[PDB]
Amino acid sequence: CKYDFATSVLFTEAELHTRMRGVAQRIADDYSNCNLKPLENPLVIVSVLKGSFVFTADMVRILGDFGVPTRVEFLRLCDIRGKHVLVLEDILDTALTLREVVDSLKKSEPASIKTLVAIDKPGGRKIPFTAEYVVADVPNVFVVGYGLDYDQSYREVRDVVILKPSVYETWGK
Amino acid sequence: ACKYDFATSVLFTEAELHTRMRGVAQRIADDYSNCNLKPLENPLVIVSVLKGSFVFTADMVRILGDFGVPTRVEFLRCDIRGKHVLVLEDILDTALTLREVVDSLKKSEPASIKTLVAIDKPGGRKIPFTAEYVVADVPNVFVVGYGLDYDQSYREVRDVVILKPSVYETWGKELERR
Ligand SMILES: Nc1nc2c(ncn2[C@@H]2C[C@@H](COCCP(=O)(O)O)N(C(=O)CCP(=O)(O)O)C2)c(=O)[nH]1
Ligand SMILES: Nc1nc2c(ncn2[C@@H]2C[C@@H](COCCP(=O)(O)O)N(C(=O)CCP(=O)(O)O)C2)c(=O)[nH]1
């Protein structure tokens, strides 16, 4: 590991962007008949969690690459009724946050609504929940990077790494 | 001959923005070299102001990390006493927002405080204000991209472009509903 605060690099910046391009192609095809256009009818991007800003910034730019115009909202509301909504989240774990955000947004009745997460932790669920688009899976380990923090730190790490246990063991004390 | 059907001209590409952000990142490293910036213990507190500033913030913190500047980010659209604060903003124009934030933040008595803007309109000031770091200047022209929006749209354009007048001449008359 090139990082002195990590035991392993799980996904590099290039790997994530490669995967996110595969997802952007699915989104473009998926919404091909939604008549998405700037101002008139963009895809409403609802970014959840403070750390999601890194992923949201890269995803929205990649989405524009594939002809998907967007409009970003942050909850870390606008006018979603009748409009297509895509919730983005950097990590999906217990799914308790996503379920609540999805259910509440439905109260506004948008044309459609789907979710996209950068890191899915399939093994952390406390309720059933599947995201329409997943960039990468991560086992049951504490990772930081790509916006994911440990106590507000390491968000800027370009890759998704396993935080060396000596880091958070010494920081709690 | 523009690559964007909605823009008259492209001012700064993503790559050019990053090349500039690399030069800025080196200066910040030198400037804070005596501050012992360290993750968790003493990170440089990044205050990102303005909704569209998430794009510049996402890229800037990452570049800064490349140059040995560990950061933690807050958003304005925490404890700062004794900490080093770098306010980040995608566009600086009248300076009214940045003046409010900086002077409101000085009340908490941080270790220091500076500002870094991606786009500085030197000629738009309503009050005097100079940013400590500026990635690039822009004149009296309406631009979009790199997080800068026109009515929430076009933030995702990877470059800072001048938006075609027909777009906002048309959309304004559409916003006129009543
Ligand atoms: N760095 C890092 N964090 C992890 C990891 N596993 C879980 N988490 C966090 C833990 C908690 C707080 O998250 C603040 C995010 P923030 O600071 O940006 O606000 N979470 C949620 O509550 C999401 C519920 P879900 O998404 O399932 O609905 C996700 C990991 O492995 N590494
Ligand atoms: N896209 C684009 N916007 C421009 C341009 N010139 C000015 N603005 C805006 C105008 C107003 C709205 O700001 C939206 C931020 P948001 O919608 O993301 O929240 N602003 C401020 O008040 C900054 C306070 P200052 O900089 O003086 O301290 C900046 C341009 O050329 N292109």
Author numbering:
A (entry chain B): 5 to 80, 101 to 197
B (entry chain A): 4 to 80, 102 to 202
Manuscript text:
Inhibition of hypoxanthine–guanine–xanthine phosphoribosyltransferase activity decreases the pool of 6-oxo and 6-amino purine nucleoside monophosphates required for DNA and RNA synthesis, resulting in a reduction in cell growth. Five compounds synthesized here that contain a purine base covalently linked by a prolinol group to one or two phosphonate groups have Ki values ranging from 3 nM to >10 μM, depending on the structure of the inhibitor and the biological origin of the enzyme. X-ray crystal structures show that, on binding, these prolinol-containing inhibitors stimulated the movement of active site loops in the enzyme.
5 is a nanomolar inhibitor of both human HGPRT and TBrHGPRT1 (Ki = 3 nM). In human HGPRT, it is the phosphonate group attached to the carbon atom of the prolinol ring that enters the 5′-phosphate binding pocket whereas, when 5 is bound to TBrHGPRT1, it is the group that is attached to the nitrogen atom. It is hypothesized that the loop surrounding this 5′-phosphate binding site is less flexible in TBr than the counterpart in the human enzyme. The carbonyl group in the TBrHGPRT1·5 complex does not form any interactions with active site residues. There are no magnesium ions in the TBrHGPRT1·5 complex, and, as such, divalent metal ions do not play any role in anchoring this molecule in the active site. However, these bonds, together with the other interactions in the active site, are sufficient to result in a high affinity of the compound for the enzyme. The prolinol ring in TbrHGPRT1 is rotated by ∼90° compared to its binding to the human counterpart. The TBrHGPRT1·4 complex refines as a dimer, while the TBrHGPRT1·5 complex refines as two dimers.
